Design a protein around this ligand. Sequence first.
Ligand SMILES: Nc1ncnc2c1ncn2[C@@H]1O[C@H](COP(=O)(O)OP(=O)(O)OP(O)(O)=S)[C@@H](O)[C@H]1O
Ligand SMILES: Nc1ncnc2c1ncn2[C@@H]1O[C@H](COP(=O)(O)OP(=O)(O)OP(O)(O)=S)[C@@H](O)[C@H]1O
Ligand SMILES: O=C(NOCCO)c1ccc2cncn2c1Nc1ccc(I)cc1F
Ligand SMILES: [Mg+2]
Ligand SMILES: [Mg+2]
Lengths: 268, 278
Amino acid sequence: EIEASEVMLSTRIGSGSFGTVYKGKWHGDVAVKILKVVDPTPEQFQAFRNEVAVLRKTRHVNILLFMGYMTKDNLAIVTQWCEGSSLYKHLHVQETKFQMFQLIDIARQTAQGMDYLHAKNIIHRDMKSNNIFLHEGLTVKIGDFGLATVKSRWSGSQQVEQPTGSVLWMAPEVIRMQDNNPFSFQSDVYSYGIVLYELMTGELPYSHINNRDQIIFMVGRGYASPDLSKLYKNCPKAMKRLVAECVKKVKEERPLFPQILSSIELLQ
Amino acid sequence: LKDDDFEKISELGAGNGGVVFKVSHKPSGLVMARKLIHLEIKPAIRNQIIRELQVLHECNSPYIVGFYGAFYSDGEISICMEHMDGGSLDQVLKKAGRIPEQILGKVSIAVIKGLTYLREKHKIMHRDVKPSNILVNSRGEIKLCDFGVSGQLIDAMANAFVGTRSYMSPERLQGTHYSVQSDIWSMGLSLVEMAVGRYPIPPPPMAIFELLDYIVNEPPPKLPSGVFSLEFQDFVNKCLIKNPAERADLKQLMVHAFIKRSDAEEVDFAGWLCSTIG
Ligand SMILES: Nc1ncnc2c1ncn2[C@@H]1O[C@H](COP(=O)(O)OP(=O)(O)OP(O)(O)=S)[C@@H](O)[C@H]1O
Ligand SMILES: Nc1ncnc2c1ncn2[C@@H]1O[C@H](COP(=O)(O)OP(=O)(O)OP(O)(O)=S)[C@@H](O)[C@H]1O
Ligand SMILES: O=C(NOCCO)c1ccc2cncn2c1Nc1ccc(I)cc1F
Ligand SMILES: [Mg+2]
Ligand SMILES: [Mg+2]
């Protein structure tokens, strides 16, 4: 745990699915996310602390550092601060004009980071364009990975085991909740495929649906899928096959991240 | 209206879209509700949403909440509405086990009058008829809030985190053509959720998509018979019809015997609300 006296909370940045972001100055610039959990049960807190350990070990150029947690300023996590904005801001809010090779490079770096995260058996749930930051300009940084014990609420000693996070990137199998543990490598692969669609389209999927509920229902039932006619004409064909591969409804047919990385390495 | 001229007094509530704060207007000295909806959108979309929300100035009716202005401060769209002491009706379900039938009829009358005012004067459908989106006052007034004035605001909201419950009609979830009948279906669902002391999609927890499948392909929920009048069961059943064509439109709802009888009845809603919320 990190002692809160050394950390200093600067101006608020925003809020998300399971925490609120403050700018901190603990041994340099950091980001402190106070969790929405008010009374973390000892079991949840202990499993979260084990996470704190595992995520603190993780070290890739493509994932943000995870310094630790603090239980004094309510329940909080200290992570690496990223001056570069989020990928969602560049693609949609700022409408950043990325060249073809730049988009391919963002995809490659994201795939590399998720590959490492998956090699240590870390399922980066809540995978979306919000959690990807373009540090130094183009280096991709994955954040808010793991933390399954916190993102989901707890019914005492039992995790609620219900979906949480944005629905445009959520997998049909984790949308349906047909299994107690639907979060897996293939769910992260589908979420990466959704971010791939956003990279290759510049727009959020299911733009013809205005209500999130209709999105959830028609995604889980399969009536709605991200149509591939929105992709750029200059997008290479194998890139289109790769993204259609990643976004397939069937869980097991989606490729694992080494295969995707080989795909972009062929593309480049 | 600007951000610097409000002093947050308290929190009115927080939802998936945003959080509403009870604040004060320094230039005028009156207490108003300030809804902060956090979203990351283009500045052009921000201006478009603000201009579309300006239309709320001429939406004046006893059955819709007041509106003073709207503006974008920092990464959030802020809307300024008039303060309802009773909050919303979901607060009342958290207070009382179940809403009585007569006040439920008063609520139904208020919501249909608000819906028909909106449709006749503004050609605007609510789309969000929920227990959280109708508000009550200490004097007995019942108003509608969070209806679809700005289409671009709805489009920006579409990118939202997963929810816990839903009040959507099946025709919207299926993607078919929707009209006010969707709002009638939603308000019928709301009437069921008020009359019984629980969220009535899974009839006497279940995930969001399972809720949505269940309300798409299985029969609509119905009130527990024997503890409610036949008239209010007829009203909700006509409201809760899967087929939009068979579902009653507003014009039939005004002349619906439930609405006329509840209008004839005199119910001291202000006193009951004060008793149940303190
Ligand atoms: N390490 C960080 N460095 C800089 N900004 C950050 C960092 N972590 C979060 N933010 C910002 O904090 C705001 C809210 O982020 P979050 O709370 O993580 O929500 P989110 O990332 O959009 O989605 P989730 O599911 O809640 S993680 C956004 O504006 C992020 O850009
Ligand atoms: N004018 C008001 N007076 C009193 N309470 C209000 C007023 N406006 C909003 N509230 C409260 O603020 C809460 C937050 O509302 P929202 O942010 O719209 O979330 P919501 O109404 O629950 O719907 P969603 O789908 O969850 S965003 C409401 O549930 C009300 O209890
Ligand atoms: O607030 C909204 N939804 O919140 C609950 C879930 O819908 C909401 C939703 C859609 C919308 C389209 N144009 C404005 N919109 C909203 N804002 C709003 C509008 C008028 C009033 I009067 C009060 C308000 F809060
Ligand atoms: Mg994030
Ligand atoms: Mg609301």
